């Protein structure tokens, strides 16, 4: 369809052929998942999505620098608490989060790229994605990894700049974008379903606060207090010059994805900003909302004939590398952390067969989960990822932090607090997945107690309550560096300048 022209397929085939050739010859920070989620949330809600990454850095480096002299992830818990129950439970959370926020989302972004590059169904898309993933893995893709990773991040970002200009040239430049966006919505706001009826203007017009990082703290998409605190909590679970470069590349996404995500809504309002349920289905595959098509739609309908194929190939290659790496990590974790514990005999070949069968099992589970991903948190990938992280990680972060700071905590108390935090998190994961989330068009029947609060304020609540549980149970039961610092503060100043500019 979009790439039906010979040139796009030629570049895609050439790129994949070179990737496989290097993989045979053997014998990063940003993937396609973020390139999809950030752009989708930028199209849907404005630019407060970029209020995550920048904030994350201003926390990460702080907790990367203000914790080093005092602390010097799971391995620390292993030394501090000992035993094996906490090891097994942390491995279980790691596997579940890999399935939910690293595997399901990676395949979903893959199906949201092949869907808008060819038009295939979600399953027809992930089937091809996983077939090519298997080809990549069986050809020694992981054997190269770091070898052919830098080059990827030297094009996927670089090419993402080529799109940036191509996106910013079709909106009359940077100044032009900031007038067009507020005045860009759908022309189809009438639904044939009698129950839906006419669609209100609140959730088909772009938000009034689409240009401010600090949204309303009570009625905002990304409340600033929730933003700050929830992100500093979640970032705990998810050399120094490496961190400085990571921050440099972490500042850009606002200009590279979020804003070109904002451009999608104004070049393609009917598709990216669809509000009518059945209209989204014919566009997307789901009737909850489809900003997630923001970046892939922009890539396929904006990039030239020859560079669109290159962008698709690079996105798919990075997604393939991420998926293969996470499959390998999950298999290794399962067959060296949990299954081995269940079977101490340590069979010569069982530890490998069980790894491959686990790989197949998680592939199946994530394929079954894909429908939930495509219709999670109003159809926004970034919101779903951060919601799952807010539901699962904050308890682990609380246990880690109170272990680092408080020496009166107990391993048994730590484990009980961790199970309490997981149970608390499943009181919003399960109910806000089985009952759905829904957009303003079709609000879900979820009780106001559960879905009323933003997932970041739930991160705050769950972190604090999990910490309190851990502490009470533990008590109750039983008894050139100068140059690096200068560059770090320069980067921090630049980041706060960017925050103030878009505050």
């Amino acid at each position: 369809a979009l790439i039906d022209n010979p040139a796009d397929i030629l570049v895609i085939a050439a790129y994949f052929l070179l990737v496989i050739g290097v993989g045979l010859w053997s014998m990063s920070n940003i993937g396609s998942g973020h390139f999809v989620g950030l752009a989708g949330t930028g199209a849907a809600s404005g630019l407060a999505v970029a209020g995550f990454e920048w904030n994350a850095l201003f926390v990460v480096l702080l907790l990367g620098w203000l914790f080093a002299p005092v602390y010097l992830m799971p391995q620390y818990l292993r030394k501090r608490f000992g035993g094996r129950r906490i090891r097994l439970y942390l491995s279980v959370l790691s596997l579940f989060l890999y399935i939910f926020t690293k595997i399901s989302v990676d395949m979903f972004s893959g199906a949201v790229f092949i869907q808008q590059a060819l038009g295939w169904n979600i399953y027809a898309s992930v089937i091809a994605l996983l077939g090519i993933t298997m080809i990549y893995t069986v050809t020694g893709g992981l054997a190269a990894l770091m070898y052919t990773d830098t080059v990827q991040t030297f094009v996927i970002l670089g090419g993402a700049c080529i799109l940036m200009g191509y996106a910013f040239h079709e909106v009359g430049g940077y100044s032009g974008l900031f007038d067009k966006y507020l005045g860009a919505a759908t022309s189809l706001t009438v639904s044939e379903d009698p129950a839906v009826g006419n669609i209100s203007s609140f959730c088909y017009r772009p938000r009034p606060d689409s240009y401010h990082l600090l949204r309303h703290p009570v009625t905002g998409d990304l409340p600033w207090p929730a933003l700050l605190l929830g992100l500093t909590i979640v970032s705990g679970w998810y050399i120094k010059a490496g961190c400085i470069l990571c921050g440099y590349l972490k500042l850009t996404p606002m200009f590279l994805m979020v804003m070109p995500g904002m451009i999608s809504r104004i070049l393609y309002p009917d598709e990216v900003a669809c509000v009518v349920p059945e209209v989204c289905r014919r566009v997307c595959g789901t009737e909850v909302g489809c900003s997630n098509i923001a970046y892939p739609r922009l890539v396929v309908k904006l990039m030239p004939n020859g560079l669109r194929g290159l962008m698709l190939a690079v996105m798919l290659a990075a997604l393939m590398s991420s998926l293969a790496s996470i499959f390998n990590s999950s298999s290794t974790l399962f067959t060296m952390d949990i299954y081995t514990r269940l079977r101490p005999r340590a069979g010569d070949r069982e530890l490998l067969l069980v790894g491959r069968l686990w790989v197949v099992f998680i592939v199946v589970v994530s394929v079954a989960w894909l429908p939930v991903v495509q219709a999670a948190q109003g159809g926004q990938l970034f919101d779903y990822i951060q919601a799952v992280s807010s539901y699962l990680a904050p308890p682990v972060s609380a246990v880690f932090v109170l272990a680092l700071f408080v020496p009166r905590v107990n391993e048994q108390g730590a484990f009980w607090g961790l199970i309490g935090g997981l149970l608390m998190g499943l009181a919003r994961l399960i109910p806000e997945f089985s009952f759905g989330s829904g957009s303003c068009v079709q609000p879900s029947a979820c009780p106001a107690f559960l879905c009323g609060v933003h997932y970041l304020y739930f991160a705050i609540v769950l972190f604090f309550c999990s910490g309190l549980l851990t502490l009470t149970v533990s008590l109750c039961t039983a008894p050139w560096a100068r140059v690096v610092n200068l560059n770090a503060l320069l980067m921090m100043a630049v980041a706060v300048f960017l925050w103030g500019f878009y505050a």
Partner: peptide, 30 residues
């Protein structure tokens, strides 16, 4: 109604003040 660059410069100045405080505290006592 401060311009965006006013807000950016204000943030930079505030952070530089905080950095000066954090440098003076350890300049005075460990």
């Amino acid at each position: 109604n401060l311009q965006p660059w006013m807000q950016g410069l204000i943030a930079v100045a505030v952070f530089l003040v905080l950095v000066a405080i954090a440098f003076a505290v350890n300049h005075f006592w460990c």
